[PDB]
Each structure stands twice: as structure tokens, then as C-alpha cells.
Amino acid sequence: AIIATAFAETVKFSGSKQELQKRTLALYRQFLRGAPTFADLYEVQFSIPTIRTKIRQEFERHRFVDDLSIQNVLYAKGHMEYQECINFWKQQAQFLKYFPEEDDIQGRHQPSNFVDKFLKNRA
Amino acid sequence: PSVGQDLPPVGGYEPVQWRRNLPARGFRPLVYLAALCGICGYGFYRALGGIQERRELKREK
Amino acid sequence: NIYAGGSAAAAPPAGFRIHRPATWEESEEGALSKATKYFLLAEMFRGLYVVLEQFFRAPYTIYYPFEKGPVSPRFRGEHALRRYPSGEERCIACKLCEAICPALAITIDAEERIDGSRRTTKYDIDMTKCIYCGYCQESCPVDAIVETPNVEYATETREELLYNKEKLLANGDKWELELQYALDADAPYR
Amino acid sequence: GVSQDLPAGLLDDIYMWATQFGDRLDEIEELLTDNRIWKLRTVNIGTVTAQDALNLGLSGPMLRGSGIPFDIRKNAPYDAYDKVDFDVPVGMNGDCYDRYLIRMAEFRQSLRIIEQCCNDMPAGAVKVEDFKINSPPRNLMKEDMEALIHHFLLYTKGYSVPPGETYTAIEAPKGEMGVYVVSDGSERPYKCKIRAPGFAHLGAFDHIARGHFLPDAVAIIGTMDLVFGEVDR
Amino acid sequence: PSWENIKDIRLDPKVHVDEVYEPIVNPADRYLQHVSDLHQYAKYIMAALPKYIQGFSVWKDELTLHVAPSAVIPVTTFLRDNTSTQYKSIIDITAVDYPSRENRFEVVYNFLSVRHNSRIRLKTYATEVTPVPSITCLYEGANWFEREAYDMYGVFFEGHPDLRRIMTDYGFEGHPLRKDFPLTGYTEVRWDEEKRRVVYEPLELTQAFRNFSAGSTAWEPVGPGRDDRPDSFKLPTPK
Amino acid sequence: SVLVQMREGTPIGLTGIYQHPNPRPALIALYEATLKELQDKHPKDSVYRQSIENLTAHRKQIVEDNEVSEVIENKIGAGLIEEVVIQAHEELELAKKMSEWKPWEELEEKPLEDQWVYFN
Amino acid sequence: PFDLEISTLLPYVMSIYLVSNYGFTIVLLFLLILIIGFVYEINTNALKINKHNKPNTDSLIYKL
Amino acid sequence: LPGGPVPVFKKYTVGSKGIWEKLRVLLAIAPNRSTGNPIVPLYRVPTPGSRPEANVYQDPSSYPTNDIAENPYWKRDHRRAYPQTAFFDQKTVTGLLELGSEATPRIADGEAGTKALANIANGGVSFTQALGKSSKDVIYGEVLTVNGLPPVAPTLAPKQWKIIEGEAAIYPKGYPCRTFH
Numbered sequence A: 001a002i003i004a005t006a007f008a009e010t011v012k013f014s015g016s017k018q019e020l021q022k023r024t025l026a027l028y029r030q031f032l033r034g035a036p037t038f039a040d041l042y043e044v045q046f047s048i049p050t051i052r053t054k055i056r057q058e059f060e061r062h063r064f065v066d067d068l069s070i071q072n073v074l075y076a077k078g079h080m081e082y083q084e085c086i087n088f089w090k091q092q093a094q095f096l097k098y099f100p101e102e103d104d105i106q107g108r109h110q111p112s113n114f115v116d117k118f119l120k121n122r123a
Numbered sequence B: 001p002s003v004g005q006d007l008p009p010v011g012g013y014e015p016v017q018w019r020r021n022l023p024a025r026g027f028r029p030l031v032y033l034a035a036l037c038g039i040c041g042y043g044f045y046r047a048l049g050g051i052q053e054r055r056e057l058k059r060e061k
Numbered sequence C: 001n002i003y004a005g006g007s008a009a010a011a012p013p014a015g016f017r018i019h020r021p022a023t024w025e026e027s028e029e030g031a032l033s034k035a036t037k038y039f040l041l042a043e044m045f046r047g048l049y050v051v052l053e054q055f056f057r058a059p060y061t062i063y064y065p066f067e068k069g070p071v072s073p074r075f076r077g078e079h080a081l082r083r084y085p086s087g088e089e090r091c092i093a094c095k096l097c098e099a100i101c102p103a104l105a106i107t108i109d110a111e112e113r114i115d116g117s118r119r120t121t122k123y124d125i126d127m128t129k130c131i132y133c134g135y136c137q138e139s140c141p142v143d144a145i146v147e148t149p150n151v152e153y154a155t156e157t158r159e160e161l162l163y164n165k166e167k168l169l170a171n172g173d174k175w176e177l178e179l180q181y182a183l184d185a186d187a188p189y190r
Numbered sequence D: 001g002v003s004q005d006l007p008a009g010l011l012d013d014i015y016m017w018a019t020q021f022g023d024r025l026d027e028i029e030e031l032l033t034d035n036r037i038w039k040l041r042t043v044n045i046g047t048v049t050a051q052d053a054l055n056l057g058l059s060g061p062m063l064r065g066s067g068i069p070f071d072i073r074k075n076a077p078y079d080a081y082d083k084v085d086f087d088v089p090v091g092m093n094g095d096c097y098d099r100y101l102i103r104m105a106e107f108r109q110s111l112r113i114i115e116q117c118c119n120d121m122p123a124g125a126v127k128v129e130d131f132k133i134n135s136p137p138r139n140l141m142k143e144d145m146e147a148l149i150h151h152f153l154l155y156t157k158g159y160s161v162p163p164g165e166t167y168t169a170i171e172a173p174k175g176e177m178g179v180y181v182v183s184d185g186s187e188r189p190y191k192c193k194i195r196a197p198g199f200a201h202l203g204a205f206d207h208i209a210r211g212h213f214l215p216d217a218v219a220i221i222g223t224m225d226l227v228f229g230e231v232d233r
Numbered sequence E: 001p002s003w004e005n006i007k008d009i010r011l012d013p014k015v016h017v018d019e020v021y022e023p024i025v026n027p028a029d030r031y032l033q034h035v036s037d038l039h040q041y042a043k044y045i046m047a048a049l050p051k052y053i054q055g056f057s058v059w060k061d062e063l064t065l066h067v068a069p070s071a072v073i074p075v076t077t078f079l080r081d082n083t084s085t086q087y088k089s090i091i092d093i094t095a096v097d098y099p100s101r102e103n104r105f106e107v108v109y110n111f112l113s114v115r116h117n118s119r120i121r122l123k124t125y126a127t128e129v130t131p132v133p134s135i136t137c138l139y140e141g142a143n144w145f146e147r148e149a150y151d152m153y154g155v156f157f158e159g160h161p162d163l164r165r166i167m168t169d170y171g172f173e174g175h176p177l178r179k180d181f182p183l184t185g186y187t188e189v190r191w192d193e194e195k196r197r198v199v200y201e202p203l204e205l206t207q208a209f210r211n212f213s214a215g216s217t218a219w220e221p222v223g224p225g226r227d228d229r230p231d232s233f234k235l236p237t238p239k
Numbered sequence F: 001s002v003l004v005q006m007r008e009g010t011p012i013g014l015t016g017i018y019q020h021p022n023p024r025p026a027l028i029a030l031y032e033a034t035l036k037e038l039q040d041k042h043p044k045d046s047v048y049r050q051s052i053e054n055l056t057a058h059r060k061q062i063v064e065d066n067e068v069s070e071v072i073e074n075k076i077g078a079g080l081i082e083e084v085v086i087q088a089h090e091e092l093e094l095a096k097k098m099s100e101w102k103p104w105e106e107l108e109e110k111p112l113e114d115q116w117v118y119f120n
Numbered sequence G: 001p002f003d004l005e006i007s008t009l010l011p012y013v014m015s016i017y018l019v020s021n022y023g024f025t026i027v028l029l030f031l032l033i034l035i036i037g038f039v040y041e042i043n044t045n046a047l048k049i050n051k052h053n054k055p056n057t058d059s060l061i062y063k064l
Numbered sequence H: 001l002p003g004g005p006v007p008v009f010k011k012y013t014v015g016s017k018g019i020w021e022k023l024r025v026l027l028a029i030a031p032n033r034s035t036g037n038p039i040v041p042l043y044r045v046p047t048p049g050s051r052p053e054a055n056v057y058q059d060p061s062s063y064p065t066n067d068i069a070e071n072p073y074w075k076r077d078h079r080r081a082y083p084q085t086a087f088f089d090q091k092t093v094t095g096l097l098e099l100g101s102e103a104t105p106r107i108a109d110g111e112a113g114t115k116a117l118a119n120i121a122n123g124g125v126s127f128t129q130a131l132g133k134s135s136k137d138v139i140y141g142e143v144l145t146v147n148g149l150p151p152v153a154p155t156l157a158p159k160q161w162k163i164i165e166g167e168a169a170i171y172p173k174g175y176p177c178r179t180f181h
């Protein structure tokens, strides 16, 4: 038959927000635990704490989503991303998409006020 | 109408060969076995004759 | 008759059940003949002989670029812009080639020429976008844009493959005679 | 239809190629069909049962090797396949060797059909004779006003297709090739999904290859007859 | 008896037709009786599963059943396992985006019965948050198709054992076959020498895409058509 | 118990399906079981029940009237007798699942009015 | 072991005439003993890699 | 048996002459086999760019489509006579069950028929009450077959298979590949 792969979870839409909260915290634990494996697979310059910080920021972004269906989709996609990272299916190039700040300073001029944005036609 | 079109011959083309054509060749297997036996036996005759004559040369030396 | 959940065409054909496989004891060939075939590799030797027969046949190779493979009047190679026998350009900037182009490889600009003619001021083909389908040549109402039979125009830089109007007109001037052979052979079929 | 008519000397040349292609096939069969090493690599390799073949979405040889006589050319005839005579090869072991034999027999049946087409090619038009669908011939386009208008419109806007949808399938060389096209009544298809037989075959790989050795996997890939432009479209 | 004297086929007398005769026939006509049969067949199915079959449609030789998502498993089971249907092969699963509908996505299943030499189509609907029941339990071949449908459209399939992207790049954001996804996407790649790696950046095109669909016709092109319904499937008129 | 499918023995021409030793009793048993399931769990009014009853009765009559497998499979018209046994088993399992699904009822999800609107 | 068996015959082929009939008998006994070990290896299927996964051959039975 | 072996001198391939032909016939696995090299004077000659037929080719057409005097376009406009897609929801089929059909009516005239059509079109009768109310005659004629059986999944063109055995088969008896016609 056609069997599932490493760290594959069948898609199940949780009927309750608490039963989803359990699964979500388990996924967060999985990510935090895989951080050192990630740093080894993807030959990263930065530290393991930086990876774990990034993971926290990712999970933080959806801290206030209310609709159960949306949380279900966010969870299923987050698990897909975990499976992609832990199996080394990603290359370094796509993994480093998650760490834009880790790259060096892009230049002297990142405008913040109106006048600087207006001088670069970005007002 | 139809002028200058590529068309088939009035009688058609002669049939082409499309069925498998791999005819059996060679003597029956036992003929090859008999030939192998004969070759090996003649070779053994010669080799043993040579060994025996070599032994008599050894005696002379 | 009347079928339930079936039909005559879903009935098994006559003889669909296969015959039982024969056992070893019901074999026509004696074990010594089979062993002869087995140990002396009979069919392998037949295969070797078939390969050896080829060794004495004429090879198929041609000595490019001193010889050339077959080319037909319909062949789609590098693009050119053609003229009338007077020397006037044939393209009148209808932009049908640009509209039909499946790869959006053609970019055209036009306006009225100082003599009043409708003519292009810009005709570009991105040869690295083009798929060499020949749709532009089919679409053109005046046989202006054509594909020559030329395939030997590889370049060392990509910038050389962005053809502007001067390059395409020069190609037309260069290849007009071969273009005329191809047209004389295939125009009735278009 | 087709975009242009056949050139003048083509049927004769196809016939002369056909008179020798049979020998060309015989010599390949001399190298392969009875070779004991070929059989060691193909017999009982990549076995699929008939029921599992149906359940996995396999088609073409991948299906006919398991003993099921299905072929769209005979079951749902299209363009001229009803007018020509040919046979359909069906396997029984559902393995790579049966599929090889099927493909070699299909060579011969195609040669048969090509000869019948060389003998029965009729006269007339090669595209539909409505200039609202296909472009008119060039000498009409440069002489007749309606023809020029229709040519202009076909090459700039395209014809409009009545709204609706279809799934259409043919017996492509690698199995059943289908398209599901949805028309919204405009000149551009609303939706177009391609059903590639190689997609379903590669999907079935994990079921078929389990428990084999790695070279058996190479042989199974070869028996599926995969081209990857088909696979990922 | 040598190839040196093989006869020249190039000079054999060819056939010459004076006029070609091709009668005028509507292609749809050949379907009429079959259309009737499909109607009858669909009536039976709807009479047998009235809990499930929202409706059916018939176009020339293609029969479609329309069902709610929760109906998918029973009806499919019926289609696979009933003696008069026996649709053992799954042909394809895809989605179609209809942004005007409250449920964006219609999920389309095509099935083949080699037993009866017959095809059938089944439709249901879904949104970006409401999943569909996976039919992998009934057809193993469905597996990859549902994955493609998830990758291209974002439709989820409940019960799918291993549901992940199959076509797009790892970490690809978006579902490209949605009508609101732009043709060239949002991001492009290049090789970066400073970083020594392939990098992703916001899309920038040396030549912008030119969309010529602005030249679509200002006149309705085809009209209404004609109806091919059999008389046994039209409501009677009083008197 | 009923022997549905042999998975070894004499191959018949379809991979994975082998010759059934005693197929007519297997057919009769499976047909009895499905008629019993319909009579005990399906409404006498339901169209599903009428159709499956009449079909099963027809096939059972054909099996009981005929001793020879090839005659039977020509009259049934749905493949070799092994495939007919597999079909009867499939129909029985479908009938038992139908008892729980209850398809004779009114439909539970009506479509919204916009749901099935195309471009015509 | 098989390599050592083969290489132990070198003294025999270099001394065959000198030991002629007695040594011929002895070398036959030696070969037969080693062939018993070859027999053990062949009958135990010691060098066969068995494909762990095999097609299921169980019948399908339904409890009616 | 058509398709059978044809001699090598009937194949458009170069081959050998003289003493070498005798040698090849003595040494070939299969003497009737061609070499595969096309005969240069015969093959693809004249070249496609110098065909005489090009100067006589005319656009081909068929009667009556090419007639100048009796074909209005709208009589052969098949694109605009396309079949409409017929959609049936359960209300329509309810109406078919109760009121019968245009082919075989079971409706009364006057206001009665229009009001019956209206009250099925509003929701008065459900599909299941429609089915339960339906008589044996309706159920057998118009849902099942006249024998009470269900209709089978229909086929546009039924295919009767035949198995070719013996000499006309593609492979001989041993091979695990049969010939279906």
C-alpha cells in the first residue's frame, strides 16, 4: 500500500479549542526539541537559542486567532513545516528564508520618517 | 475538390512484415553435447599421450 | 437474456480462463537437452551473434559539419524580417504576430512614417523566450516575419540573443534566397 | 484537425520505412526476449495484482499486464481507430517481463495500423471547414473580405468555446491520458487539469517497490515508463 | 530478385478523386440514445440514495452527481461496491476555484468502471477552512491526487494519512491555482555571491507580463444552444 | 464462513485471483446473507432494497439453475465466477454498511442557491 | 576456509607423480571431506539474502 | 498468414550483391532480414523542396460545404447548436415521479396541472414522500427496469472481446502474453 513517511500526522480537525491547544503545545515542544537537529542539518551560522527564539516568534504570531477552523489550518500547516524541516527535505536555501534578520546589514538607508521615504519615492 | 494531394496507390502497397520473425537455428542440443564430448576426448587423448612421453623423456634425462 | 448488474460485453470471452501451467514431468524435452541449453548458454550465444552481425553493416553516422541532416521547407529556425522586391519592408505593424505569440516573445512599436506609411519603429524578439512554434509566421498577413532553416547561431553572451529590428532585417536580407526556396515549396500548403 | 496537409512524397517514404521496421524489432527481440539475464531482471519484478492495479489508478500496460483487457482505442474509439484492424496484448503475471512483452507486441500493432493508414488515406480537407474555428487558406485570406476578418479575429481574439466542461481521455502510449477542461464561454479556458498516467504510476511506486532490492527499483522505474514533464506539469 | 531491381513505388498510379463528399452532421446527435440511458441511470441512483444526491447533470456522455461533503464517503462506497456501478478505478481528483460562490472550491472526482466500460463524475464543495473527507480509505490511488489538490488550492482532506505539498518548492507560500494568486507569484530566486547561496527576493520583471485578455469580444459569441433532454425527463405541460 | 477469494493455487488469468474450489455454494451462501440483511434492516419501500433484492434473486436463480461455471458466467455477464463471488461479497458488505448509513431518508444537507451555478 | 582448501592442493599438484597412487587416494579423501562442508553450506542456504517482504497469500474469508 | 515474413528483396534497404550476397545468406541468422540503410536513389527523392506537386496543389474542400449556391452558414453552424447541460435537482425528479413526463403524462389539465406543478415547485411534496407514494408501475417502468432490476452503468459503444489463439497470435503458446481482438 501507500504508507506515510517519517513524522506524518493524519489530518484531523479538532472539534474543540482545548483539544487543539494540547496538540499545538505538543507541536511547539517538537520544534524546540528539533532545534539542534536543525542547526546540524542546515549548517547555520547562528546559535541554537536563535533558532528557538525564531520558533517562539512564529508561534507568537498567531497567539490571538479566535476562529477554530483557522487555528486548525494554522496547526496543520505548522506540522507540515515541522515534517519538512526535521526530515531534511528542505535545503539550506529554503530553511534560511525563515531568518531574514540573520543576514547582514543591507545598506546605509532604511527610511523611517516621511521625508526619508519621500526622497526615495516610497512615501 | 482535391488536386495535388498525397494519396495512396490505386492497388495499394504490398504488405509489410509485422509478425515476429525469429526462426530457430542450430543443431539439436545433443549434437552440441556430442561434439563437446568428442573434442574433449580427443584433447584428453593428446594430453595424456604427451604426459606419458614427457615421463619417458624424464627417465632418459 | 436479461442481465442483472452485467451485460453481454462484460461476460468473459470464450477462453478467458488460462490453461493450467504444465509440470516438469509433462515436458517434451529430455533433461539432457535442457541441461545442454542451460550449461552452454545457447540463447546468449545467439544474442552475441546478432550483435556481431551488426559489426559488418554500414554505420549511420554523418560527418557534421561537413555533411548535414535532412531539412524541409517547413523547418522552424532563426527569425527574419522580409522585404518586397522593391526593397520596401513588408511588415506594416498590424501586430498580429505579437498578439498570437504563445511566449510573448515579440515586442512591437509603430507610428506613421514621414512618408505616411504604417511601419514599425521597434520590432524585438527575445529569442530566449521564443518557443520556435511558427505561429507568428502563420499569423502574418503579408509574409513579413518568417523562420529561416538556420539553426547555427549559438552565442557566447545572452545579450546577443535579444534581436532588435536591425538584426532581424539584416537576417531577412542575408537569408532571402533560402527563404524563397522554402516559400516556393510550402506556400500552396499554407 | 491538423495545421497543414501532408507533403507530396510522404506516404511512399513512410511505407518504405515500414517495410524494414519489422526486422528492426526482431533484432531487439533477439537481444532481449529470451535472454536469461533479462528474465532475471524482469520476471516477478514489480508485480501488481489486477484489483490493486484498478484501485491505484494504473492504466495502459501497467493495467494490461495484470490480465485486464482494457484499451480506450477499442473501448471508446476516437478519431479513426474504429476504421483500422489491430489486436490488444494482455499479460497475466502483472510483472515487468509481461509489460515488456506487451510493449513489444504494441510495436507490431502500431506498424500494422500505420500500414493500413498508408493504404486507406482518403482525399479532402484536413481541418474543419468552418473559418470561425480554423483559419482559412492564405489565398482566400488575401483575396476575400470574410476570410481576412476571420483570420484577423482567430489570431487576435481566438474562437469562443461554448460554456461547459469535459473530461476527455485517450489511450496515450504511457496509459490513459486525460484532460478536464472547464470553459466559461470565453476565448480562454477557465480551468485545465491534465491527468498524466505517470503521476498515478509514480504514486503506486511505494506500494509496488516495497520488499524489492534497489536494482529492482531501477527496473520498476523503467517499467513504469516515466517522463517527468508528465509527472509535474 | 535483388534490391537493385526493387520496383519504384514513386511512379505507381495514384488514386485521384474528383469531388470529396462529406455530409453535414451535428456531432451531438450520435449521443442522443446514450444521453437517455444516462438520464435513466441517474434517476435510479438518485432514487436509491435520496439522503445524499443533491442532483445530477448529463452532457452527451458525461454524467455528474452533485453531493454535499458529508455525503462523499457513502456515495463513493456505493459507486465502488454496488453491482450495477462497479467503479473500481479512480481517475483523478482536482479542485476548481469559483470566487463568487460562498464555498470557493468545488472538488471533482472522476471514476472509471472497466467492468461496465463506463465513467462517472462526482462533485462536492469546500472552502479555505472547511475540509473534505479523504477517500484514500477507498482508493489508494487517491493519495497523491488529494496532495496535489491541497498543494494547488489549499483544500484539506480529512483522514488523509500524509498530506503535504507535492508540486511546489519547499516552504512555498500560497496556493498558485487560486484565481487571486498572480501568474508570476511574489518571489524569485537568484545566486547571491555575498552569502554564497540561492536567495529569495520580491519579484521584479525586466519585461512586465502583458495581459491581452482586454481584447475579448464585445458581442456574445455562441448563444443559448439547444437542449438534448429526452422527453421522459421533461415535466409535462397541462393539456 | 465463506471462502471469497483464493490468493494462491491455479492462476486463472487475472493476477492475484486464483481458481475457486467450490464457487456455487459460496455464491448461494453470500446471496442468502445479503437477502437476509435487506429483509431485516432495510425498509420494504426503499428503492435500494427493491433493486438489490431483485438483482440478488436473479443471480441466485441463475446459480441454482446451472451446475457448470462457464454457463453461469455467460448468463450473469459480469466476469469469471471468481469475480462474481468477489462481487457478491462486495454487495453484502455494502448492504450492511447501508443499514447503518440509512440512505432511504431525506437528504441532510441541502445546497445553497449559489452552489451549483455555472456560466450558462 | 575455501581459499585455504584450494591453496592446500598446491603441494599435491607439485608432488603428484612422487606420491602417485597413495597420495591420489589421500587427496580424494581430503576433497570429499571438504565437499561435505560445501554440502552443509548449500543446504542451509547460508549465502541467500531473503526478501523479508513477501506477497500475502492468505485467503479472504467472510463470517456470514 | 498476413504479416508473415517477406523476402529481403522486397524491402527498401541497400543490402549486398555478388559473392558477398552468397556469403551473407550463408552466414545470416535470418536471411530475409534487411540492414536498415535506405536506398539512396529512391528514398526522400525528389527532396521536399523540389516536389512538382507543389505547383499544382490547391486548397482541398468537400461538397456540399464548398457549394457557392445552396449552403447558408446557419444550416451547418454546429458550434451554435451545442447541447445544453441538463441539470436535475431533487425537486425536478419529484415532479417527474408525481406528474409523469412530457413523453408519458400523469397530469390533469387546466388549473389543476399548473397548481400541481407549482406546489411541487414550492416544496409541498418531498422526494421521499414522492418515492413512497409512487406505485409499482411507476417504480418498475421509470426508476428500475420493467423487470424490477436496476439499470447498469451505461456504455456508449459496447466492446465484445475475442481471444486469438494459435498461429494468428502474436506470441506462441508459452509466453505470458495473449492476443485480444
Ligand SMILES: CCCCCCCCCCCCCCCCCC(=O)OC[C@H](COP(=O)(O)OCCN)OC(=O)CCCCCCCCCCCCCCCCC
Binding pocket: B033, C032, C035, C036, C038, C039, C040, C041, C044, C048, D036, D037
Ligand atoms: C549437459 C551436461 C553438462 C555437464 C556440466 C557442464 C560442464 C560445464 C559447462 C561450461 C559452462 C558452465 C558455466 C555456465 C553455466 C551457466 C548456468 C546458468 O544458466 O546460470 C543461471 C544463473 C541463474 O541460476 P538458475 O536459478 O539456475 O536459473 C534459472 C532461472 N530461472 O544465472 C546466470 O548466471 C546466467 C548465466 C551467466 C552467463 C555469464 C555471461 C557472461 C559472459 C558470457 C560468456 C559468453 C562467451 C563469451 C566469449 C565470446 C564468444 C566467442
Ligand SMILES: CCCCCCCCCCCC(=O)OC[C@H](COP(=O)(O)OCC[N+](C)(C)C)OC(=O)CCCCCCCCCCC
Binding pocket: B040, B041, B042, B044, B045, B046, B048, B049, B052
Ligand atoms: C572416466 C574416464 C573413462 C574414459 C575411458 C576412455 C577409454 C577409450 C579408449 C581410448 C584410449 C587409447 O587407446 O589411447 C591411449 C591413450 C594414449 O596412450 P598411448 O601412448 O597412445 O598408448 C601406448 C601405451 N604406451 C605409452 C605404454 C606405449 O591413453 C589415454 O589416456 C587416452 C584415453 C582417451 C581419453 C579418455 C578421457 C575421457 C575424458 C575424461 C574427462 C574427465
Ligand code: SF4
Binding pocket: C097, C100, C101, C102, C103, C104, C105, C106, C125, C129, C130, C131, C132, C133, C134, C135, C136, C137
Ligand atoms: S516562433 Fe512562436 S514563440 Fe517564437 S516569436 Fe514566433 S509566435 Fe512567438
Ligand code: SF4
Binding pocket: C090, C091, C092, C093, C094, C095, C096, C097, C098, C108, C139, C140, C141, C142, C143, C144, C145
Ligand atoms: S511581422 Fe507581420 S504580423 Fe507581425 S506586425 Fe508585421 S505585418 Fe503584422
